[PDB]
Amino acid sequence: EQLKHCNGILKELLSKKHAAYAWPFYKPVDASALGLHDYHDIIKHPMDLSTVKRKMENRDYRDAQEFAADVRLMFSNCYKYNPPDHDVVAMARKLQDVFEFRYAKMP
Amino acid sequence: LSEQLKHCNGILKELLSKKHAAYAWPFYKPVDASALGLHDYHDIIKHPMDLSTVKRKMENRDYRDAQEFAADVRLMFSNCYKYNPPDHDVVAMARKLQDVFEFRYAKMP
Amino acid sequence: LSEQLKHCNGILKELLSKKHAAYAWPFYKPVDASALGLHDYHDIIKHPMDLSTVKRKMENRDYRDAQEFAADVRLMFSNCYKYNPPDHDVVAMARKLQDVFEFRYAKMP
Amino acid sequence: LSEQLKHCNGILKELLSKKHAAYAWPFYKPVDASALGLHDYHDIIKHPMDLSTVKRKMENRDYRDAQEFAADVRLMFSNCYKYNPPDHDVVAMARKLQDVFEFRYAKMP
Amino acid sequence: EQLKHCNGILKELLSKKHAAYAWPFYKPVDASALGLHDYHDIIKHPMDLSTVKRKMENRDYRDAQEFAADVRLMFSNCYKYNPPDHDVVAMARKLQDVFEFRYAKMPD
Amino acid sequence: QLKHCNGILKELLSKKHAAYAWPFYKPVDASALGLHDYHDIIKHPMDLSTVKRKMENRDYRDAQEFAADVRLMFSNCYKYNPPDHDVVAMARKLQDVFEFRYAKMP
Ligand SMILES: CCS(=O)(=O)Nc1ccc(Oc2c(C)cc(F)cc2C)c(-c2cn(C)c(=O)c3cc(-c4cc(C)c(OCCO)c(C)c4)oc23)c1
Ligand SMILES: CCS(=O)(=O)Nc1ccc(Oc2c(C)cc(F)cc2C)c(-c2cn(C)c(=O)c3cc(-c4cc(C)c(OCCO)c(C)c4)oc23)c1
Ligand SMILES: CCS(=O)(=O)Nc1ccc(Oc2c(C)cc(F)cc2C)c(-c2cn(C)c(=O)c3cc(-c4cc(C)c(OCCO)c(C)c4)oc23)c1
Ligand SMILES: CCS(=O)(=O)Nc1ccc(Oc2c(C)cc(F)cc2C)c(-c2cn(C)c(=O)c3cc(-c4cc(C)c(OCCO)c(C)c4)oc23)c1
Ligand SMILES: CCS(=O)(=O)Nc1ccc(Oc2c(C)cc(F)cc2C)c(-c2cn(C)c(=O)c3cc(-c4cc(C)c(OCCO)c(C)c4)oc23)c1
Ligand SMILES: CCS(=O)(=O)Nc1ccc(Oc2c(C)cc(F)cc2C)c(-c2cn(C)c(=O)c3cc(-c4cc(C)c(OCCO)c(C)c4)oc23)c1
Numbered sequence: 001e002q003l004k005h006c007n008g009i010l011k012e013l014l015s016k017k018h019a020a021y022a023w024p025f026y027k028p029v030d031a032s033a034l035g036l037h038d039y040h041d042i043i044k045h046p047m048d049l050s051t052v053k054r055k056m057e058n059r060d061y062r063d064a065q066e067f068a069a070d071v072r073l074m075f076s077n078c079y080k081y082n083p084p085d086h087d088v089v090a091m092a093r094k095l096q097d098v099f100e101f102r103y104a105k106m107p
Numbered sequence: 108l109s110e111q112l113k114h115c116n117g118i119l120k121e122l123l124s125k126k127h128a129a130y131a132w133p134f135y136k137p138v139d140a141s142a143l144g145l146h147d148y149h150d151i152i153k154h155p156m157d158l159s160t161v162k163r164k165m166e167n168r169d170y171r172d173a174q175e176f177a178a179d180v181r182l183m184f185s186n187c188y189k190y191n192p193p194d195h196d197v198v199a200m201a202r203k204l205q206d207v208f209e210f211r212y213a214k215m216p
Numbered sequence: 217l218s219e220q221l222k223h224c225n226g227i228l229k230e231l232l233s234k235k236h237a238a239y240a241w242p243f244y245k246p247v248d249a250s251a252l253g254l255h256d257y258h259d260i261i262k263h264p265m266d267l268s269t270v271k272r273k274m275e276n277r278d279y280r281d282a283q284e285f286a287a288d289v290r291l292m293f294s295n296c297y298k299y300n301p302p303d304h305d306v307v308a309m310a311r312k313l314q315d316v317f318e319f320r321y322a323k324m325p
Numbered sequence: 326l327s328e329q330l331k332h333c334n335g336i337l338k339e340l341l342s343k344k345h346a347a348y349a350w351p352f353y354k355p356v357d358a359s360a361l362g363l364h365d366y367h368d369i370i371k372h373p374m375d376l377s378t379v380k381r382k383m384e385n386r387d388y389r390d391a392q393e394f395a396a397d398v399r400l401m402f403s404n405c406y407k408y409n410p411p412d413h414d415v416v417a418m419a420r421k422l423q424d425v426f427e428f429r430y431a432k433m434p
Numbered sequence: 435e436q437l438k439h440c441n442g443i444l445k446e447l448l449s450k451k452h453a454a455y456a457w458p459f460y461k462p463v464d465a466s467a468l469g470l471h472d473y474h475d476i477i478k479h480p481m482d483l484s485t486v487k488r489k490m491e492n493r494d495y496r497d498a499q500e501f502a503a504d505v506r507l508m509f510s511n512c513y514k515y516n517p518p519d520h521d522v523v524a525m526a527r528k529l530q531d532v533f534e535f536r537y538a539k540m541p542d
Numbered sequence: 543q544l545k546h547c548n549g550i551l552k553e554l555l556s557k558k559h560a561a562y563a564w565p566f567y568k569p570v571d572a573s574a575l576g577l578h579d580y581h582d583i584i585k586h587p588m589d590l591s592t593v594k595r596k597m598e599n600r601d602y603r604d605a606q607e608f609a610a611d612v613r614l615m616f617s618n619c620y621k622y623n624p625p626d627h628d629v630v631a632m633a634r635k636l637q638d639v640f641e642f643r644y645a646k647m648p
Contacts, residue, residue, distance in 0.1 A: 016362035035346035037167050058146050128253035144234035276373050453576035469557035
């Protein structure tokens with residue numbers, strides 16, 4: 001019902017129409033490759049879109065509250081780790097604007 | 108003690124080494140659950156671990172002492188025993204590498 | 217024909233799918249000779265191949281036709297049969313994945 | 326000389342090193358045209374290149390000499406300068422990393 | 435709880451981030467290996483970060499006022515002993531700027 | 543013979559040369575100093591305490607092997623570091639001491 005609407009939002013963000021600011025969230029942050037030593041000291045529960053897609057197909061979200069929480073966690077990790085100036089916070093805010101809007105229009 | 112952790116580093120070095128490649132490789136990187144088709148991996152294993160992550164944590168100074176380092180390596184083996192049935196090959200490789208580990212950890216001065 | 221490279225994509229997508237993961241995983245990436253201790257690997261295997269390489273070449277559109285695609289995927293399997301003894305798990309996995317390959321290739325328009 | 330391939334290996338190891346990670350990351354893997362929505366990338370760029378590929382070729386021993394390595398590492402940067410307009414972040418990161426490359430290549434016995 | 439932030443502060447003094455200027459303060463001053471035959475007459479109470487670490491883990495510190503006072507003892511000990519010119523005074527200066535700030539940034 | 547050598551060691555380790563010998567007393571602690579690349583660049587680590595451990599062992603059969611290891615410790619420090627860092631200056635001040643007393647050996 002609403003779970004089915006949550007897919008279409010998850011699809012809409014994984015979609016290519018926001019790929020220009022959605023890309024830093026398609027896969028988990030690679031702290032090793034990015035040479036980020038403290039990423040996991042600071043981020044207790046990483047999240048990213050692929051990991052949301054995983055949990056969707058396993059049916060690990062019962063409600064939309066659990067789905068929105070992981071998507072919001074993905075964004076909060078980014079706002080937590082990074083300083084406000086960084087270009088990844090600006091794309092998180094653009095992608096989050098897309099999400100919150102699409103989530104608000106849920107029946 | 109820094110002597111402990113220096114020796115723990117030595118153990119980690121020995122687990123990653125050439126000589127145990129045959130049975131250590133399954134633990135060089137996190138379990139790629141999506142690549143392996145393992146839908147229920149991260150519902151069963153709350154706290155993944157591997158030797159890449161133990162090197163990272165050690166390099167990062169996340170290990171207060173030798174016990175913290177052992178808890179992780181041991182956690183890596185227990186997840187492997189948790190997720191898998193006893194007769195899968197990966198359980199037999201854990202046990203050989205765990206046997207390398209417990210010995211070296213036991214012999215630590 | 218772009219039609220037959222279209223079908224080579226399906227073949228690959230199929231080879232890479234969760235369906236076959238249990239025997240497909242060792243061809244997902246190049247053989248890491250370094251990590252696995254294989255000092256003679258690159259002496260014996262002059263032209264390594266694996267499925268990520270194949271995919272990269274596909275997205276690159278480096279395959280002039282389906283025969284080129286097929287020659288790489290078979291090079292992958294022959295590399296494996298050339299290097300390993302015939303009892304090794306990887307050989308039995310290769311034959312498992314190659315039966316899938318030789319079937320979907322064979323049943324292409 | 327495989328002595329000059331040794332140094333190119335040092336160069337690569339250096340380009341991949343954590344020091345340059347803030348500007349090297351876009352070249353760590355091939356450009357994902359699908360994921361990024363670049364429906365004209367493969368029309369414009371005929372021979373894509375990135376550092377993973379270079380490493381795989383180095384391990385495969387596909388490079389006859391240092392010149393050949395350099396042509397690939399340079400194809401990576403040109404490809405980037407060709408596709409993108411000059412204002413884009415990624416052109417600025419290319420030039421930054423290419424400065425490390427051009428320096429280290431030049432300091433070669 | 436304020437001792438929980440203190441421990442976070444100590445975690446940062448010890449991290450790779452400050453390792454070009456914090457290393458003099460990881461172990462106690464080894465006066466005899468250094469040939470500092472006066473150190474222990476001038477510095478009646480040595481301090482260093484591994485002693486702060488080890489005191490945290492016995493719960494030696496009753497409040498933040500006490501954890502602060504040892505990190506500061508460690509810095510004063512450096513300033514008390516050395517000439518203003520020496521490389522190690524600068525390094526304590528630098529690391530103290532990291533301590534004084536993160537201690538100030540403590541919620542209360 | 544190595545009594546001349548082991549007397550050279552006691553002198554390098556002693557208090558007279560501590561203000562420039564201090565970085566060579568124990569092995570280089572690359573983790574505590576934050577040097578990821580140190581052990582890939584310095585294959586064979588060396589330091590004076592380890593030189594003392596090799597001696598007590600009676601592993602140094604002949605004086606060249608003692609000299610190659612004191613020299614290696616120094617050659618590691620020149621190999622790893624740029625010339626203008628302080629620790630290359632201190633290595634040079636200690637190797638001056640080492641060399642002008644190893645040269646005066648029967
Ligand atoms: C698709 C997952 S990935 O494979 O790990 N790829 C990836 C690539 C770039 C990322 O961050 C950016 C982004 C998004 C834009 C940019 F211009 C530069 C960087 C480094 C990021 C990235 C994502 N998120 C969510 C983050 O929170 C952060 C933080 C950082 C980051 C990276 C570096 C190197 C940093 O250090 C720069 C100076 O040392 C800092 C402060 C933050 O990078 C990301 C990720
Ligand atoms: C180096 C990390 S990696 O990039 O993800 N590579 C990797 C590769 C193979 C792994 O497991 C093996 C191993 C080790 C041997 C083998 F013959 C087959 C498999 C699947 C494993 C693997 C490691 N560990 C620690 C595990 O606990 C498990 C469990 C499983 C696993 C995989 C599959 C496909 C399974 O399904 C079999 C039929 O469905 C089961 C039951 C378990 O795989 C691993 C990992
Ligand atoms: C995703 C590629 S990877 O990152 O390099 N990971 C990987 C992991 C395991 C591999 O091989 C297996 C496989 C498939 C199953 C198994 F139970 C044990 C091993 C070692 C192999 C592997 C793949 N292929 C295609 C091979 O031909 C061979 C050969 C060998 C291999 C490995 C070791 C350690 C070997 O030595 C055994 C005892 O010294 C031998 C003889 C062969 O491993 C692979 C690769
Ligand atoms: C690790 C390879 S990856 O998995 O494909 N990830 C990746 C991530 C970011 C990339 O480029 C950046 C970078 C580096 C920073 C940034 F703030 C935004 C982008 C898009 C790029 C990237 C690399 N190179 C070499 C390129 O030439 C280009 C070009 C583009 C690109 C992307 C988008 C969305 C673009 O916008 C299309 C219209 O909206 C344009 C014009 C170019 O992205 C890359 C790649
Ligand atoms: C990691 C602790 S340790 O095992 O005991 N090793 C150690 C190593 C170097 C130390 O100080 C430095 C520093 C930091 C930089 C430098 F270029 C030289 C020295 C000697 C110091 C050191 C730390 N602190 C906090 C100090 O206050 C002082 C003072 C001195 C010191 C040492 C010597 C040899 C001194 O020279 C005596 C004249 O021959 C003087 C005047 C002061 O060294 C330290 C300690
Ligand atoms: C007694 C063994 S110990 O316990 O590991 N202690 C120790 C302490 C200081 C050392 O080097 C100095 C010295 C001597 C003075 C100084 F002000 C700063 C450092 C880092 C060194 C040291 C010794 N030798 C032999 C070296 O070659 C090097 C190189 C380095 C070193 C350290 C840092 C932080 C460096 O900076 C990294 C970039 O910021 C660089 C480039 C080199 O430190 C030592 C060692």
